[PDB]
Amino acid sequence: KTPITEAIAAADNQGRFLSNTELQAVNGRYQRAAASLEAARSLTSNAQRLINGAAQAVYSKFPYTSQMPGPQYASSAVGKAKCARDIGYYLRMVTYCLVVGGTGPMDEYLIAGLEEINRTFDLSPSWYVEALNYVKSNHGLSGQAANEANTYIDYAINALS
Amino acid sequence: KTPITEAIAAADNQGRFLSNTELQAVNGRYQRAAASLEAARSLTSNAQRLINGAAQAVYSKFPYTSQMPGPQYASSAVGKAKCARDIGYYLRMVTYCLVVGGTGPMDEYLIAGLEEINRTFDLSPSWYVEALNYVKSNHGLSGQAANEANTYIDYAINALS
Amino acid sequence: KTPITEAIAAADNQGRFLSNTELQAVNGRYQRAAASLEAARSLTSNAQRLINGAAQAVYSKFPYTSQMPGPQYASSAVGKAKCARDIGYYLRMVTYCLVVGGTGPMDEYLIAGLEEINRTFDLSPSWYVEALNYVKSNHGLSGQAANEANTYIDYAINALS
Amino acid sequence: KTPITEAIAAADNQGRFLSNTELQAVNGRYQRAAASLEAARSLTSNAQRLINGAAQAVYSKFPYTSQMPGPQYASSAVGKAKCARDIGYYLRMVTYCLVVGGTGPMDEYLIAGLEEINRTFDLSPSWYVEALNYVKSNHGLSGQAANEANTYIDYAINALS
Amino acid sequence: KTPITEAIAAADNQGRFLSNTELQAVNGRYQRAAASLEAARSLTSNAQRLINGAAQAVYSKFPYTSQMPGPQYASSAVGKAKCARDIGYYLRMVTYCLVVGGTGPMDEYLIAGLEEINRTFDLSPSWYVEALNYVKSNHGLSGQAANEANTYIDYAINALS
Amino acid sequence: KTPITEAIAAADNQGRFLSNTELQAVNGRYQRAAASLEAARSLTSNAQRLINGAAQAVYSKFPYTSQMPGPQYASSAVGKAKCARDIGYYLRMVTYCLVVGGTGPMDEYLIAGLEEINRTFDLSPSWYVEALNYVKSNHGLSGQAANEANTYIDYAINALS
Amino acid sequence: LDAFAKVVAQADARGEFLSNTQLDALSKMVSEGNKRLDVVNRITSNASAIVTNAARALFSEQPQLIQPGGNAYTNRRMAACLRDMEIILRYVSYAIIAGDSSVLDDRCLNGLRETYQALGVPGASVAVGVEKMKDSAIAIANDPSGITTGDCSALMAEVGTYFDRAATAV
Amino acid sequence: LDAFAKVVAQADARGEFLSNTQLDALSKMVSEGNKRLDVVNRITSNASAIVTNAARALFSEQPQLIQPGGNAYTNRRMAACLRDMEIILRYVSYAIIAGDSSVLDDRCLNGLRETYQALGVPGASVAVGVEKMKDSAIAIANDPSGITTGDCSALMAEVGTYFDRAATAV
Amino acid sequence: LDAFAKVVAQADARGEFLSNTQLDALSKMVSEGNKRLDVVNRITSNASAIVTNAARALFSEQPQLIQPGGNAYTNRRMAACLRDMEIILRYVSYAIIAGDSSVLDDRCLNGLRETYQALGVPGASVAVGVEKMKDSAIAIANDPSGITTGDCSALMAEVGTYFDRAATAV
Amino acid sequence: LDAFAKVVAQADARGEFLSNTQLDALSKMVSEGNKRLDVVNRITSNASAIVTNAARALFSEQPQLIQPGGNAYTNRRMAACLRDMEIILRYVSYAIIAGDSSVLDDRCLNGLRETYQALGVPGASVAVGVEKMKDSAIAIANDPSGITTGDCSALMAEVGTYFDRAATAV
Amino acid sequence: LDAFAKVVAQADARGEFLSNTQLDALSKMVSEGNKRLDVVNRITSNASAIVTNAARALFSEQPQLIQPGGNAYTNRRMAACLRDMEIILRYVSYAIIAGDSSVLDDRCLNGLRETYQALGVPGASVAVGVEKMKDSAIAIANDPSGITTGDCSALMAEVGTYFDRAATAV
Amino acid sequence: LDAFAKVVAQADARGEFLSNTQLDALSKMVSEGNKRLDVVNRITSNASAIVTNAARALFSEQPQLIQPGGNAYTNRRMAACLRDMEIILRYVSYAIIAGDSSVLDDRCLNGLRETYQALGVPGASVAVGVEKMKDSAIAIANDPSGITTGDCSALMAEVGTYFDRAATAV
Ligand SMILES: *C(=C)C1=C(C)C(=O)N/C1=C\C1=NC(=C\c2[nH]c(/C=C3\NC(=O)C(C=C)=C3C)c(C)c2CCC(=O)O)/C(CCC(=O)O)=C1C
Secondary structure, three states, X not given: OOHHHHHHHHHHHOOOOOOHHHHHHXXXXXXXXXXHHHHHHHHHHOHHHHHHHHHHHHHHHOHHXXXXXXXXXXXXXXXXXXXXXXXXXXXXXXXXXXXXXXXXHHHHHHHOOHHHXXXXXXXXXXXXXXXXXXHHHHOOOOHHHHHHHHHHHHHHHHHOO | OOHXXXXXXXXXXXXXXXXXXXXXXXXXXXXXXXXXXXXXXXHHHXXXXXXXXXXXXXXXXXXXXXXXXXXXXXXXXXXXXXXXXXXXXXXXXXXXXXXHOOOHHHHHHHHOOHHHHHHHOOOOHHHHHHHHHHHHXXXXXXXXXXHHHHHHHHHHXXXXX | OOHHHHHHHHHHHOOOOOOHHHHHHHHHHHHHXXXXXXXXXXXXXXXXXXXXXXXXXHHHHOHHHHOOOOOOOOOOHHXXXXXXXXXXXXXXXXXXXXXXXXXXXXXXXXXXXXXXXXXXXXXXXXXXXXXXXXXXXXXXXXXXXXXXXXXXXXXXXXXXX | OOHHHHHHHHXXXXXXXXXXXXXXXXXXXHHHHHHHHHHHHHHHHOHHHHHHHHHHHHHXXXXXXXXXXXXXXXXXXXXXXXXXXXXXXXXXXXXXXXXXXXXXXHXXXXXXXXXXXXXXXXXXXXXXXXXXXXXXXXXXXXXXXXXXXXXXXXXXXXHOO | OXXXXXXXXXXXXXXXXXXXXXXXXXXXXXXXXXXXXXXXXXXXXXHHHHHHHHHHHHHHHOHHHHOOOOOOOOOOHHHHHHHHHXXXXXXXXXXXXXXXXXXXXXXXXXXXXXXXXXXXXXXXXXXXXXXXXXXXXXXXXOHHHHHHHHHHHHHHHHHOO | OOHHHHHXXXXXXXXXXXXXXXXXXXXXXXXXXXXXHHHHHHHHHOHHHHHHHHHHHHHHHOHHHHOOOOOOOOOOHHHHHHHHHHHHHHHHHHHHHHHHOOOHHHHHHHHOOHHHXXXXXXXXXXXXXHHHHHHHXXXXXXXXXXXXXXHHHHHHHHHOO | OOHHHHHXXXXXXXXXXXXXXXXXXXXXXXXXXXXXXXXXXXHHHOHHHHHHHHHHHHHHHOHHHXXXXXXXXXXXXXXXXXXXXXXXXXXXXXXXXXXXXXXXXXXXXXXXXXXXXXXXXXXXXXXXXXXXXHHXXXXXHOOOOOOOOOOOHHHHHHHHHHHHHHHHHO | OOHHHHHHHHHHHHOOOOOHHHHHHHHHHHHOHHHHHXXXXXXXXXXXXXXXXXXXXXXXXXXXXXXXXXXOOOHHHHHHHHHHHHHHHHHHHHHHHHOOOHHHHHHHHOOHHHHHHHHOOOHHHHHHHHHHHHHHXXXXXXXXXXXXXXXXXXXXXXXXXXHHHHHHHO | OOHHHHHHHHHHHHOOOOOHHHHXXXXXXXXXXXXXXXXXXXXXXXXXXXXXXXXHHHHXXXXXHOOOOOOOOOHHHHHHHHHHHHHHHHXXXXXXXXXXXXXXXXXXXXXXXXXXXXXXXXXXXXXXXXXXXXXXXXXXXXXOOOOOOOOOHHHHHHHHHHHHHHHHHO | OOHHHHHHHXXXXXXXXXXXXXXXXXXXXXXXXXHHHHHHHHHHHOHHHHHHHHHHHHHHHOHHHOOOOOOOOOHHHHHHHXXXXXXXXXXXXXXXXXXXXXXHHHHHHOOHHHHHHHHOOOXXXXXXXXXXXXXXXXXXXXXXXXXXXXXXXXHHHHHHHHHHHHHHHO | OOHHHHHHHHHHHHOOOOOHHHHHHHHHHHHOXXXXXXXXXXXXXXXXXXXXXXXXXXXXXXXXXXXXXXXXXXXXXXXXXXXXXXXXXXXXXXXXXXXXXXXXXXXXXXXXXXXXXXXXXXXXXXXXXXXXXXXXXXXHHOOOOOOOOOOOHHHHHHHHHHHHHHHHHO | OOHHHHHHHHHHHHOOOOOHHHHHHXXXXXXXXXXXXXXXXXXXXXXXXXXXXXXXXXXXXXXHHOOOOOOOOOHHHHHHHHHHHHHHHHHHHHHHHHOOOHHHHHHHHXXXXXXXXXXXXXXXXXXXXXXXXXXXXXXXXXXXXXXXXXXXXXXXXXXXXXXXXXXXXX
8 A cells, every 4th residue: 555556546446547636646745755755764774773772761661671580571581582573573664654755655564463462472562652653753854854764754653551 | 426435435435444545545635636727727718718618629620510501500590509509518628527536526426427418319429529629728727636627537538439 | 138028127126927018018919010020021132232231321412421531431442341241130120129129239230339439430320320320211110111111210210319 | 925925025025116028928828818717717617516526426436435444434424424424625725726827715715724633533535536537537628728627636646536 | 063063163253262162161161961872872862663664654654655656666675775864864863963962973974965965865754754743753852852852853853854 | 241141132134033043052052050149149248358359369479569650650648549459340240140041241331442551551461460370269159150240350361451 | 816816815815705796796807908908018118208208397387307416416326216217107007007006005195105205205206207108008009090990089088097096195 | 032031132331240239139049940940841731731722711712713714714714713722821831931021022923913903813812822821820830739749939920920921022 | 148148149149030940940949939839838847746756766766866875865964855856857947948958067066967967866766757757748748638739749758858968967 | 525525515506617716625624635635644553542532531420320220231232332432433423524514414423413312322421432532533643743833723723513413412 | 173073074074874883982982071061271371371382382492483584583473473372272172072084184284384484484493392282281281180070181182283283283 | 455565465375484585576657656656547548549549449449349230330339439449448548547457357358259259349349449549548648758768768668568468369
């Protein structure tokens, strides 16, 4: 799913050529893309720092996650690596959404099945909400680039709430 | 149907808030609107001249339409008035499409039922295609305003072909 | 589709043997067939004359069709041949309807897709209505044979109106 | 259900005027009606004799039906009256089928629910088959009138077998 | 169909593990099985006597079945063998129902198609009802074993009524 | 939903009387009811102690739940009361399941909507799993009464995992 | 119901065979069958012209219907209007072949008044259209040319009743 | 609802555990379970006879029902009538196993009076049929032969109430 | 296809009117129409007996079919077997009225061999049943009693071909 | 309808082109488009918090709603309640992007009062929840931080009207 | 089929009553019924833990499955994988209550190998997961604590066969 | 997929962020966006003429297609043929806006060769029609009149590839 494939899908569902409405929709994406791609480049360039900082923000907010025994916690080397990996997944998904101009990548790769996974593995959505909030507070973006990044970060937060 | 109501309808069909994709789509419309509204203002200001000229273009291309007896022809005062009225309808519909940013008004008010009406009343689609071509050739628009007007005029021509 | 296949289809749709009602329906066809087959033989024997005369009737009623340049008109040798061919198709379809006892052949071979074809190729239904009217006025049939022929000719006219 | 209502229903199901096929079907009924109405008049005029004789034919073929105690048998005055009543119903239904030109009356008034009734009340279909066979053997009709009567009598026999 | 397969089917239809309700249902069957299996063993051990006696009970109640010519009657050696065979089928089905704990075997092997067969071959349901009543009156079971046997015999009687 | 209403629903869905299979199913419930009702009486008599102890077990296992500020935690008087209330709800639901012989009450009153509520209000399923485990470890039931109680407690745990 | 079924239904409710008088009346309907088929064929064969000419005359007399804001303005509403004229003509033709108005009443006219009122369709204007179709349909059906000469006055009165029934219903 | 669910639903709305008295009442229902199952089995096992004998007696007493024009005349209407008798018996049997009339009320009796009035089904006659089934069903259920002797008077009164409820509803 | 449509379809693919010879052949089919209708009516009117007697004779000759484990054992399989005999007779009767085997081939016989093979239905035994129906159907259709005397030998040969086609297909 | 379609629909019914004044008004709506998109984005981006905080505040003020027997007691009813809050917020957001309340009225608010009355949902309590969402949504939408400074007072008044419309409707 | 139906089906095809030996074998299955129910209850009651612990162990041993590009990478694929583990456990539990593998074969295992091959699901890895579930399920089912002491060795062997059947099928 | 999604999908399977080089390539696609939209608009705006002129030229060159017996003879087959030309043009236009052929391949071209072979549609003739549309579509899209002058040669090559892909597929 992207702004362009959604336009194509709507047209195809009705057996018709792309409408002027749909061309305007694609233009709308092209116009927004400068801000989106700026956000993607920046988040990518700062990825390791954002991921490391976000993980630390979670451990700080929820100290028990570093202490309690169990596979679901970051109280082992494996657990700490799983956590940083997951946070990296979220950040990577945000950059994909920015690149295509919609939530499709996040929806398909991350949000579908999320509730099942979090319940099954005893992972708290609130841990991930804190990581995402750290990213918002620390990406250092401005203007519409910041707006774009925060829109997709907030989309993930909404899904976890 | 408009770019905005289509965005709302897509969101509602899926039980969700408007997506960033849909906000970009609405932005796309807003960006295109300057050209659309310029075209609408111009066509409106020149309406009588365009309608009169278009009707004459049809009578010129198809001389029999002024001569042959029958209610379907412009060979009576009533018939000539019907024809100018219809051409005015087409022009008015084009301005409505420009205003809302899509073919919705033309689709609902004119294209739905068109083939039935033209067959029932023995009206030739080609007569209307000539009127529409006259408008394209004589509106005097430039740049993207001309593009917008011609896109909707061509949409009507496609429906008649 | 024929009176007999329609009877079979109705019976089969309900998982039952042919009803006495359906046998009466087939008898009804057999009784009407003398008039139908007389009409078919006559129209066939006079085919070239009816086709030539019908084409001329159209050119007479609509003189522009012989004059205006364009592939849709009978203003070229190819166009005149296309027109006579089409009129021959209509006459042939009428004879097929007479033979089977219903509009099935005309419905399948000619009426399905008719509106699309006429719009796509800029052919006026009214041209064909005049050809069909010429055939009615000139077949020289009487009694129920004339009734049968005119019923199917009128069916085609209704489809074009 | 009649030949005419079936024609109307087929036309209406397809949103169209009656076809020439359907007019031929109705003509088929009208042609057959002379034989049908002759059969109806005759069976009606001989009704009491046919009913009385048919009942006796059943009691003769199945002597136990006059002897065995139980409400399902003709071994009481009430039972004998029920039996003659039922046979009268069958004969009356046959005359209705002849009148309308199809099995509709018999289907609606008698055949729908027949198997349930016969099982529930312990009535043997074979009793009724004998009554119907008596009627065939004793109506004294000839030619197509006999054909019509026997067609509907046989339809009832098939339903009971 | 059995109590256990019905429990599995209900669970599977809802994409879930067996419920405690369904385990209780299976326990209910296991508890009833002692009586059911006792009934099955007894009926089986006495099968020939019950079948022979039941056939005689039918011939006694309906003397015409031994006398009237025709394939549907027990008035020939073949017919008498068919009848005893059928009664044996009913008894065997009852033992199968007892074994699995429900009517599944009888429903699948005997009741589905029963009305068609009895009408087609002119067999009277009442003949079989008498055979089944003989079995009830002569199996010699007591307590819940008798209850189980009679429940399934009565189920067959209901189907024939 | 109960074992009895499920039996009725299955019968009604198929337009039939209760089957012997369904009567066995209801018997299965009646047999199990002694153990179920014993469990219900005991859990009820010990309710306050089980609820208080379960709440303490959660606070012990997850000390942060008494400390962290926020409406989702038991770090305020309101929060501690909410938690004890919820645990009481779970216990009460278990007694209802025992009483009716299935999970219907828990499914309708508690499990439907559970995931939405826990995500919306930031409540951790694991908190409730600990409370339920405390109840299992402390009800003091034996034999099949213990089995019944633990079956429904485990059902809730599965839903939370 | 057709005319034959109507009598049968009444008889069944009384448990009676049709009388000789009733049978004779049905035979009479059969004898008039050719004329009845000609009426149906002639109306059907001219259906497009009957509807279109009536619609054109209606819009000429009531120009408001087609002006902007009028109920038959826009091609979608015009098409729906033409469709309704055709639908009524179609159901009238069914009533003719049946010799009974039940199909016209049951499948077409019942509830139509209220349907139109709810939509804002001017029922009185539909009735004008229907009456225009009545006149042209009867003129066509009763045309003395190209048919074995005979008396169809009874049939034409009957046809009139079906059109009138439709006009009344709206 | 069954009897158990009924008490639970009331308790949940009050946020309360069942009391010991309530639990004891449910235990009592369980102890009467064998008798209740025998009632359901006996009625089910004799269902065809219960319905057929009641219907036959009804038509004998009210011959108008079956004469031409009568509501149970024609095999289709007769089959529908027999079906309704069976349907009512079936839902009564469900109420018995449940120890609660809610299924009978909700899925069968609610709106039935108005349904019958609209169709022209004589509800008062259905009630006569239902009361005939009541008497034969109770006689069968309470038959002293072939069963461990005991007191089922309370159950028979309860069964009576369900039949009466159905008769009242029509 | 019916016989008339078959010729029309072939002609259309060639872009040709039917010839006088072809028209005459169709007129001949019409003239034989009464006989063809009598054949269809006689077979239809005796359908239950034709199927039942053929099935009975089949099971008498092949007792294995009905013994436990046999393909026609159980009432469900017996009913399916009788249904198939009726289905084949029905489609043969359609072919007769059509004067063409296309409906029989397209809706009934195509894929039937493979259907039977997959299910374990003994196709060869079905063919025996079909041939038994052929003989009784022709004997009934060609019965000299109660009908205007005439020659139906051509029709009886044609009817035979349809039955044979069905038998071959299984 | 959106604001643009609304004017077009009114014009079409009058058969008129939009006036220059009308075109200028539409151009003005376009020029305010960025602000309108920010409002929709901000509300959407904070939707879970807006609904949850309003619901929590509602239940804190009206504890009866959640106590046993209360309309929002049980997880199923609580989920339905939270869903309704979200649904209303969603349709309000649609009205904002459209600059017209028609979608909110037509698909959400019409018949809602009667729906709630029939179910026993306390509409007055829903209105309290809606008004709580109004205040938090406007505070979020009109937050001066992290956005190009400008005047959105007109938009905030408009947003208020949609929330008020919803509250009134229940 | 359940174990009881299996014997009945075989007997019916032979036209035979069950023998005393066969009846005794069924009685034996009934006598082991309590143990069988305990096995099903214990597995069901621990289903989430059985699946989750087996899945976790599988992913720990085969880290490739969860790395980007791996078949269980993405939450949608992970959820599908966990679902499949649960589905297999569920159908194994059905086979246990039935004392027959037919439901497991017919509704779950048939065609699964080819389904996985077409999708790119590593069947061999699913088998590892299934075998892990086998070990934990049997350990749970055969736990000596909190249950009347007795011998369940035969049942545990049978349970093993169903898990093995599933593992083989993939 | 669109061009953007294609790169993302490949990256996700590798667990990688897009590189700066990849981001720059996407930015370049965006910068060419106006030209791409003009291509799509021009083709769409002339769709009827593109299809009709190509079809007319095809039938002129291959008169057999339209003669009796030919695949495009009869109005139904002609309409289907024109529809297929339009369908291919439509899917090509989708591929253009997407900058990727996946929609054209997945929803249109996959299986089309075999579909045509089964129906008897001459695929080679469809390819001639497609190539005619290619030439007229490119001539229209690349028309120097009425547009800001610039270089679209890369786009025209890309458009060519989609048409060629379609022609090859048939
Ligand atoms: C072969 C079949 C029959 C042999 C055996 C027998 O010697 N004659 C053969 C059948 C014939 N029927 C004939 C006349 C005839 N049959 C019908 C019956 C149909 N007409 C339809 O309207 C109805 C359908 C509902 C059917 C059934 C009719 C009306 C006639 C004409 C009047 C008659 O003679 O009774 C003939 C004679 C040749 C013919 O008139 O075509 C044969 C031979």
